[PDB]
């Protein structure tokens, strides 16, 4: 409801989004190369090495998935806060498994 | 526009969402096991045996699909009404085929 | 922020959505038949030969993807403007490759 | 060892070949359309509606499998006997499930 | 029956094997990259740029297919003759489409 | 040519067959679960825990591959010797990677 409450909820949703991707990618119904690639996309995003548009483009290619029109703006508004909250990307990845 | 109008529109969208899943799963371009599994997820959701977060987690795994950040909150706001409107889950499934 | 600003942003997002579909479909990690089919869906949509609901239904089938509850309303609000802006659908397709 | 013994062994192998195809196709890890199509190929072959080369060509397409250079000659030498031994193709299919 | 008759039959089978691979790869149920790759394997084999063991290893990887124990020796005995018979590999490929 | 020479050649072919399966399964274009499953099939076969017919049935299911009529008899004639030659199945698997 407040801007602050909205921000915090977006952050939690975005954590859940990235951690689900890792869980899916790491499930072993998936190719070992895909899993490493999704882990690396998520880590680079979290480390600020890539930005939302390029992460989503590469993700759709990696998973052979279809585009989501609200996904980039969601990420763009959540990532600055989540990043400040997520000082160790490797540990986040490890924790999502 | 009104809260009531928004609610009704969410319900119709959510019906269309679940009925599309069934149609896709039942098309015969899909594995017979997947189809039975998606039917069972949809029925359990509609019967209140599972909730939105767990349904979506299992669905992404079943279809090997990618996460949708707005999907859980969409479902959470639509399902209470749709459920009261959908007294027979088996008939809903049957009707979506 | 203004209605006009919102409209223009929706149009750009929708261009990016359709052009990403074409890029994905044309990448050569995909079946030649799928690519031709996605190109044809996108062109028909842009030419007003099909509408948002039918385009999305057919797309989910073609790519064996999962439904997106906010996708149809997104398209419905963006397409009238994008269409007036996109007088040559073949050139749009060609440009997205 | 004798020609007669070789013939009988080829027939049993060919029964096992066609019944395995049916079992695989009917397992529900497969698309419902594929299963119906493989069942129909096997039945037509057994009923003499199609011959070995055309059956194998269509099968490779249906299962998206790779060619087997010894498969056609195997089938050609086994099928005349197996067919005389297999007066009801529907029952064979049913039995292999 | 004679060695000469056996040789000629092996050659025809091997032509049919390689031409089927091309037909399958070129059908458009397949990825554009796979098709180009299978075409290139077949051409290199026919041009003597690669030998039977390496062609089959790469093919199994490209099509994600399973190994065939009699395939290499089949190819090894057929290829020397087929190659002398097949002075233009590009035309063979073109003809198999 | 001699029975002894034929036996030794069958053994080498069968080693190459099983080691290729492991290489394919371990390439990381494959699901982590598939790889573990193919490794376990190959080890059980080599350890005499399963026999040729059951190994091939399970393999076709695991890789969603098509049946090979000459595969079981090939394995049956090769395995007794290869097994006596292959005192450590884990090391064979490890070596094929």
Curated annotation (Swiss-Prot), chains A, B, C, D, E, F:
N6,N6-dimethyllysine modifications at: 12-13, 15, 23, 29, 39, 49, 76
Subcellular location: Nucleus
Organism domain of life: Eukaryota
Annotated ranges, domain TAFH: 8-97
Assembly and oligomerization: Component of the TFIID basal transcription factor complex, composed of TATA-box-binding protein TBP, and a number of TBP-associated factors (TAFs), including TAF1, TAF2, TAF3, TAF4, TAF5, TAF6, TAF7, TAF8, TAF9, TAF10, TAF11, TAF12 and TAF13. Component of the TFTC-HAT complex, at least composed of TAF5L, TAF6L, TADA3L, SUPT3H, TAF2, TAF4, TAF5, GCN5L2/GCN5, TAF10, TAF12 and TRRAP. (Microbial infection) Interacts with SV40 Large T antigen.
Its biological purpose: The TFIID basal transcription factor complex plays a major role in the initiation of RNA polymerase II (Pol II)-dependent transcription. TFIID recognizes and binds promoters with or without a TATA box via its subunit TBP, a TATA-box-binding protein, and promotes assembly of the pre-initiation complex (PIC). The TFIID complex consists of TBP and TBP-associated factors (TAFs), including TAF1, TAF2, TAF3, TAF4, TAF5, TAF6, TAF7, TAF8, TAF9, TAF10, TAF11, TAF12 and TAF13.
Entry's disease: Intellectual developmental disorder, autosomal dominant 73: An autosomal dominant disorder characterized by intellectual disability ranging from mild to severe, developmental delay, speech delay, behavioral abnormalities, and non-specific dysmorphic facial features.
Annotated family: Belongs to the TAF4 family.
Name of protein: Transcription initiation factor TFIID subunit 4
Species the sequence originates in: Homo sapiens
Organism lineage: Eukaryota, Metazoa, Chordata, Craniata, Vertebrata
Gene from which the chain derives: TAF4
Stretch of the intact protein here: 583 to 679 of 1085
């Amino acid at each position: 409801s407040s801007a602050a409450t909205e921000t915090m909820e977006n952050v939690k949703k975005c954590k859940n989004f990235l951690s689900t991707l890792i869980k899916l990618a790491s499930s072993g119904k998936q190719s070992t190369e895909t899993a490493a690639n999704v882990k690396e996309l998520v880590q680079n995003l979290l480390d600020g090495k890539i930005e939302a548009e390029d992460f989503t483009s590469r993700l759709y290619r990696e998973l052979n998935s279809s585009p989501q029109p609200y996904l980039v703006p969601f990420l763009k508004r959540s990532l600055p806060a989540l990043r400040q909250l997520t000082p160790d990307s490797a540990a986040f990845i490890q924790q999502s498994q």
